[PDB]
RNA sequence: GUAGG
């Protein structure tokens, strides 16, 4: 957590350094999304022992929400072309995806 | 009438009430939380008896105390008033076959409510699959049996305690309020002579700085408390008044380095002890506040009042004062004293629904964290149930829970018996609870409120003493979790049939008679003395009519496995403990029999045990066939049962089932209809009851060993089936993915000559150590062939191909005879874990016979390893001929204080040849034949109650007018012994010895699992010690303590050895191996290793650790 | 024919320790292990052993059979 | 975790 407060309080040095009074709003509108560009950027490149590149942890983090959303709707585990249709990508690349998403065991 | 197969009885007083549901334990529980239909059924059952019982299901009260939620606005709610079960799709056995957790759909009808909006939208939500509990009492998760076994904690409420400090030279009060989730608080007094309170033992306070922050003034608190000097003094002392003023300093104190703030103070204290969410003392808490305190009838439900602050605060001085009696705060003149927290009022036992209902509360707890915050980030309009709520929290805390919690343990199958004695053991080990290391003294001892609600005498032997214990037979719980026992109702000293259950407090109040008490021709007492037992413990006796309830069978304090043993009374305490313990560990036999001598509860123990089927209608049988059992009811109901076939069992043992019903029997509903293992026409049989004798024989029974014929592994009376399971799975690796196939490369042909073209092994091919089961070989390895191995393929003109094989083969040291293999495939319907493509699981089942070093051991704690078996001849042999089976060394029985086992035997030679007993008119013939137990045949069973068992007269009579065998001669003489021809010698020994029929059962401490030997294995990662264990090829420990004895003889060089060439050197281990297979001497050990890995991970903390020589640097 | 077939007293009192004979009757032992491992390069330091052998044993057993009959003798440094 | 020592 406290870590996460260091990397938005990073965010917020960029947005302010990027930020003038051109801008008819308030600050909250403004640096808010480089505080969630910071904090994401953080959570997709220091979480994990084995990093993940980004597009590669944006894919995981897709498929962990529509596999969510499936379980939710459908109340049971999807076929492995249906989860291949939804998210459009083949069963392999699935089983991919799937594998390189694990965390180590101590 | 036909329940159980005929048993003679020795009992002398008639039981009033029959046993309960062995297993009501966990079933009417989870029934509750379900609330299916029979909660609701035996619910109104007890209203219109009028018995006390829950009319709220848990699961719907853990949905209604969640209370709609409310944002900062309060503008919308929803409510989840309904929830509702359908059957699951999957069997019992299809789920334990393909491994899938048996569970159920859990559907809630949420009502969205919005004032802005003012509509109300319904929609039917799955909050997640939910585990089930099949008949048994067993929740079956990913195919394996888990059990959950209730826990004893300390109830909510109220407690007082008084100590002597050495240092103060006086005694020291204090107390507590315990609740049932908030923060807890304390309160002692005369710590000093003053009082103070403990808001989480945050820091040192008064009484009156907390009294003066609530609303009571000061005035009308000196008017309530004048009485007492000691608070006057409190006081007096105090130079802050004002409530404000109180309330800033008691902030500052728990909050400091802020600036104190009224309305933060206000609801920090409101949130901590007056808010409904944070201290939400459950029903069972309030309903011991009130009695403790004596307030009468306060709120039902509801957090802590400042009524009952003040009235703890009057309760804690006046018991300071010195007064036993006082008036009740708003309530009726009570007593004041000390309360004692091993009583059994104050503990509570959270069965299995409470337990599962806490944790799905603590999920849901989180699910309303996520919406509340979701809604806090989400728009209006774009609200629904379906899309709100996420079902990930109530799943994944009920997965861990039943993973990986200590109260969820795995099914002890050993025998039905294990599996009852799993099912109703209390633990007091667990989450929130007495530890392993917070054990003391006090808690594990037995204490006198122990009786008819928790067996004394079983309980592990090991470091766990008194921290596990078994349910008493007749036990009960209460609704809010207290264990009752029932009790017969005795009026003007006759005996009324009337039962009453009483919990432990109430116990307390009368005084209660003992079952054993003879009781004449009329209701009344047969002696105007009679033993009776009151308060706290006392054993006083009271003469005449004084006496209220009494015991309603003299069996109410023994568990079940303890009421197994017969001529408990004459055992002692420990043997029968030991004894106890072990009737848990014994393993089926290919054929059991029930036993000759024995109490007459082991049906019931029997029946009520999951492993019999039991028909479930009152109709006729058509067909008969090993396989199944097809039976027809009047009504018209076609039934099959399927009988289980030696299907491995959770230790690893068979399960099979054996048909007793003939083709044209009638059945009455309930009746047992097949076996389960270590059964016999429904009847426990964990052993076999062999021919015994005592006398020292030549030294091979010395020191507990036992010594028995080879008739026992001649006619396969002590042998038992074992079945493995081992699987393979045909993973995908980064280099492709393994196949399993007969082709396997660098093996002889003759090793693939029961495979098949699959590649699996055939089905009855025999195996051993070092075989091939399944043919499966890696997709291929980076392999550089060295020199050599290039030279030698070139020559022979062979290809090193790229495909290794790895292979499963029988672990080294087992045997059997392949029965059953199961292969599942990816492409096909079923499905696996991701990656793995196909699983293959064989099972390998051998008929282990009785041999040398396998345990043996009776009912009475008598434990022995076998030690030789001698042939059949060598065997001492009665006048008769008759060889008998085992020896036993007697010079066990005075030193272990076990005598019963010498009765038993006696009696055990009376079932055998049966008793004629009519008209001879003695005291033990009357008794007999009113008893009914006169006239006997050969080989019918006996039962002798726990504690109604046979005296020593009737045996002694028995014995003088036992049936003639042969020849119209009595083979034992009146003193219970006969005289033994030798076997080898062939003379007769100088005097008779004792013989008789005993029952003997087969521990599970085989020899065939212990043994283990190591020439060279695996060796360890970070340091390479070989690493332990029979299951990878271990190495046996030499400890510290083992090493000192080698350093007393002297003895350096075995030591250096032992320490440096026989492990952590890898450099010199090899050198040996050579220097040993090639013939040379061993070389000059070296350093070790993990001495290198020290000095690496010390040198890592900043300390420059240098191994130095004393002519400067040394050589490594 | 036996691990105590020859007693220990006698291979006291010529070494005079319990520890010295064990010394001893191993430097013995490995010498002779020693030279059965020989395979022929025949070097003259070695010696063989004095006291006739059995087609299978263990040098020790015949070092401490000579120390029993003392043919041999011990000098420390 | 629980058995046996």
Redesign the interface.
């Known amino acids: 957590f406290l870590d996460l407060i260091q990397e938005g309080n990073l965010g917020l040095i960029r947005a302010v350094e990027k930020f003038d009074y051109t801008k008819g709003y308030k600050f909250s509108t403004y640096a808010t999304w480089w505080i969630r560009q910071a904090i994401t950027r953080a959570m997709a490149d220091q979480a994990r022992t084995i990093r993940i590149p980004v597009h590669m942890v944006e894919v995981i983090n897709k498929l962990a929400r529509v596999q969510?959303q499936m379980?939710?709707d459908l109340?049971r585990?999807p076929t492995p072309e249906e989860l291949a249709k939804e998210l459009d990508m083949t069963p392999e690349k699935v089983?991919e995806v799937?594998?390189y998403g694990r965390e180590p065991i101590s | 009438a036909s329940t159980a197969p005929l048993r003679i009885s020795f009992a002398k007083i008639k039981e009033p009430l029959e046993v309960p549901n062995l297993l009501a334990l966990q079933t009417e529980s989870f029934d509750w939380l379900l609330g299916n239909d029979a909660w609701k059924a035996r619910v109104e059952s007890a209203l219109e008896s009028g018995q006390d019982v829950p009319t709220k299901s848990g699961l719907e009260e853990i949905f209604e105390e969640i209370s709609p939620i409310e944002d900062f606005s309060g503008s919308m709610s929803l409510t989840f008033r309904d929830h509702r079960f359908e059957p699951p799709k999957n069997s019992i056995d299809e789920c334990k076959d393909r491994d899938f957790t048996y569970a159920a759909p859990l559907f809630v009808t949420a009502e969205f409510t919005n004032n802005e909006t003012g509509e109300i939208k319904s929609q039917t939500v799955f909050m997640g699959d939910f585990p089930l509990m099949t008949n048994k009492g067993t929740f079956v998760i990913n195919g394996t049996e888990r059990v959950v076994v209730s826990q004893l904690v300390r109830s909510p409420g109220v407690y007082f305690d008084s100590s002597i400090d050495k240092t103060s030279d006086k005694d020291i009060f204090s107390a507590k309020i315990i609740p049932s989730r908030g923060a807890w608080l304390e309160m002692e007094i005369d710590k000093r002579d003053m009082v103070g309170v403990r808001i989480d033992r945050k820091r040192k306070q008064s009484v009156t700085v907390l009294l003066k922050a609530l609303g009571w003034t000061t005035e009308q608190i000196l008017e309530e408390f004048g009485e007492y000097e000691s608070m006057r003094a409190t006081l007096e002392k105090d130079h802050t008044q004002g409530q404000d003023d109180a309330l800033l300093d008691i902030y500052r104190k728990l909050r400091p380095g802020e600036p104190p703030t009224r309305e933060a103070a206000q609801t920090l204290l409101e949130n901590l002890y007056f808010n409904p969410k944070r201290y939400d003392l459950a029903k069972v808490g309030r309903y011991k506040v009130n009695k403790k305190l004596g307030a009468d009838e306060p709120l039902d439900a509801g957090v802590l009042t400042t009524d009952d602050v003040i009235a703890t605060i009057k309760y804690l001085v006046k018991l300071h004062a010195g007064e036993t009696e006082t008036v009740g705060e708003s309530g009726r003149e009570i007593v004041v004293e000390t309360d004692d927290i091993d009583h059994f009022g104050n503990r509570r036992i959270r069965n299995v629904g409470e337990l599962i209902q806490n944790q799905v509360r603590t999920g849901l707890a989180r699910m309303e964290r996520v919406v509340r915050e979701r809604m806090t980030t989400q728009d209006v309009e774009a609200i629904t149930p379906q899309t709100l709520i996420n079902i990930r929290p109530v799943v994944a805390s009920i997965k861990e829970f039943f993973g990986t919690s200590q109260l969820s343990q795995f099914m002890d199958q050993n025998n039905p018996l294990s599996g009852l004695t799993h099912k109703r053991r209390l633990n007091a080990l667990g989450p929130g609870g007495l530890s392993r290391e917070r054990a003391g003294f006090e808690v594990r001892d037995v204490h006198p409120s122990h009786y008819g609600r928790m067996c004394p005498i079983e309980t592990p032997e090991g470091p766990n003493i008194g921290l596990i214990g078994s349910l008493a037979s007749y036990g009960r719980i209460n609704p809010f979790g207290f264990i009752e026992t029932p009790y017969r109702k005795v009026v003007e000293g006759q005996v009324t049939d009337d039962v009453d259950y009483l919990t432990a407090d109430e116990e307390d109040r009368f005084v209660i008679a003992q079952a054993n008490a003879a009781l004449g021709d009329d209701m009344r007492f047969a002696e105007a003395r009679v033993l009776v037992r009151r308060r706290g413990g006392e054993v006083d006796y009271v003469p005449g009519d004084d006496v209220d309830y009494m015991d309603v069978s003299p069996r109410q304090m023994v568990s079940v496995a303890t009421a197994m043993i017969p001529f408990l009374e004459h055992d002692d305490a420990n043997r029968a403990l030991m004894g106890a313990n072990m009737m848990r560990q014994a393993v089926p036999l290919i054929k059991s029999e029930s036993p000759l001598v024995g109490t007459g509860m082991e049906y019931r123990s029997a029946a009520d045990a999951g492993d019999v089927v039991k028909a479930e209608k009152a109709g006729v049988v058509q067909e008969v066939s090993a396989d199944y059992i097809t039976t027809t009811n009047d009504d018209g109901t076609y039934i099959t049962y399927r009988l289980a076939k030696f299907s491995r069992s959770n230790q690893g043992t068979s399960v099979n089932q054996k048909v007793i019903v003939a083709e044209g029997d009638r059945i009455i509903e309930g009746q047992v209809l097949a076996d389960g293992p270590a059964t016999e026409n429904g009847e426990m049989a964990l052993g076999k009851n062999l021919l015994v004798a005592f006398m020292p024989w030549e030294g091979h029974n010395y020191e507990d060993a036992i010594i028995l014929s080879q008739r026992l592994v001649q006619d396969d009376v002590l042998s038992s089936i074992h079945i493995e399971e081992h699987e393979v799975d045909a993973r995908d690796t980064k280099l492709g993915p393994e196949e399993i196939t007969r082709d396997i490369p660098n093996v002889s042909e003759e090793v693939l000559a029961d495979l098949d073209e699959r590649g699996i092994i055939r089905i009855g091919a025999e195996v051993v150590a070092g075989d091939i089961l399944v043919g499966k070989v890696t997709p291929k390895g980076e392999t550089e062939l060295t020199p050599e191995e290039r030279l030698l393929r070139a020559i022979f003109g062979e290809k090193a191909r790229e495909v290794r094989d790895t292979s499963l083969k029988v672990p080294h040291g087992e045997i059997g005879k392949v029965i059953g293999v199961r292969v599942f495939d990816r492409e096909e319907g079923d499905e696996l874990p991701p990656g793995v493509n196909q699983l293959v699981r064989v099972y390998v089942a051998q008929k282990r016979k009785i041999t040398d070093g396998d345990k043996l051991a009776g009912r009475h704690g008598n434990k022995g390893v076998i030690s030789k078996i001698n042939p059949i001849e060598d065997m001492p042999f009665l006048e008769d001929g008759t060889p008998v089976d085992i020896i036993l060394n007697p010079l066990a029985v005075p030193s272990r204080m076990n005598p019963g086992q010498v009765l038993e035997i006696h009696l055990g030679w009376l079932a055998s040849r049966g008793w004629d007993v009519s008209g001879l008119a003695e005291e033990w013939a009357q008794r007999l034949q009113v008893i009914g137990a006169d006239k006997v045949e050969p080989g019918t069973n006996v039962a002798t109650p726990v504690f109604d068992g046979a005296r020593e007269d009737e045996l002694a009579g028995l014995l003088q007018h036992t049936i003639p065998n042969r020849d119209g001669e009595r083979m034992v003489l009146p003193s219970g012994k006969a005289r033994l021809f030798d076997g080898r010698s062939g003379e007769p020994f100088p005097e008779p010895i004792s013989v008789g029929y005993m029952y003997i059962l087969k521990l599970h401490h085989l020899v065939d699992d212990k043994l283990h030997a190591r020439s060279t294995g695996p060796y360890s990662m970070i340091t390479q010690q070989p690493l332990g264990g029979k299951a990878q090829f271990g190495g046996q420990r030499f400890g510290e303590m083992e090493v000192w004895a080698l350093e007393a003889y002297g003895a350096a060089y075995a030591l250096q050895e032992l320490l440096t060439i026989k492990s952590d050197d890898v450099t010199g281990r090899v050198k040996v191996y050579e220097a040993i297979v090639k013939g040379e001497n061993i070389p000059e050990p070296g350093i070790p290793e993990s001495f290198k890995v020290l000095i690496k991970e010390m040198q890592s903390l900043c300390l420059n650790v240098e191994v130095l020589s004393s002519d400067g640097m040394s050589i490594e | 024919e036996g691990i105590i077939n020859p007693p220990i007293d006698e291979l006291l009192e010529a070494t005079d320790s319990k520890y010295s004979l064990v010394i001893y009757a191993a430097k013995r032992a490995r010498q002779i292990n020693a030279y059965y491992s020989q395979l022929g390069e025949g070097l003259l330091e070695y010696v063989g052993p004095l006291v006739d052998t059995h087609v299978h044993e263990k040098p020790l057993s015949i070092a401490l059979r000579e120390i029993n009959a003392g043919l041999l003798t011990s000098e420390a440094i």
């Open positions: 969510r379980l939710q109340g585990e089983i799937q594998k």
